[PDB]
Amino acid sequence: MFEARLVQGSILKKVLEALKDLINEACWDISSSGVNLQSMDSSHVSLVQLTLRSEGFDTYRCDRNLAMGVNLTSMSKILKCAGNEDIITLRAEDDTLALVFEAPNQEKVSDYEMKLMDLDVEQLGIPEQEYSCVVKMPSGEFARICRDLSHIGDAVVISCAKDGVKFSASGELGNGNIKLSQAVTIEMNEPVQLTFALRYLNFFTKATPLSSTVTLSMSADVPLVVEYKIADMGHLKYYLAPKIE
């Protein structure tokens, strides 16, 4: 028997809106430690990693470890039925996933039973390594940058140095250059210059409502890490394969 109560329903609503546009089906791994999700996209080019620590939930119980195959679109539709102030309860047994929406400002109780599916997908393991550059900046600033450069080109050249960070794009209309100065903080070891598809960065930026800040971890010839810290509850990490150069 699994039962997790989250007072901040919005968190789960936001988490699902951040995922649904990148992946359609993902396996939700439940354990005594908390909720874990690790899935790569349809184009096999980006990877999502969600961690919601049990300590982040008001109530958390997990008798047996579950691996629920969820259709993220269906779960999103269900979560859309939850009010922005609702207390969300997740309850599952070792066939379906039950979502209970307790409304604070009313005597209304919503109870949804979502059909699960069996997911035989590619499981990939990410070793936590050290990056040559780690940029921390306002999530909104980042989302604006990515949206802006999309108007110019398809790829972004992220140049990270001691001074600041630079994002550049080129297209048929000309070229663009956004230079940020060191709130923006840089934990650089070696200067890095990497090229990434803006298409995918703009899916990652859908996690913007989850955090006021974003962190970009870069090391040469390795995937980029765009992390959104949830609220001491956990995080949501997006990995993006760099462009062949």
């Binding site: 790569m40 096999h44 080019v45 980006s46 990877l47 590619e122 990939l124 393991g125 990410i126 398809d154 790829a155 090229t195 598809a197 390795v222 995937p223 990995y239 394969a241 760099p242 462009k243 062949i244 150069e245």
Partner: peptide
């Protein structure tokens, strides 16, 4: 796009 990408599997 001039450059292509390697699969995320190639890294993991």
């Amino acid at each position: 796009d001039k450059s292509g990408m390697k699969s995320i599997d190639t890294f993991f």
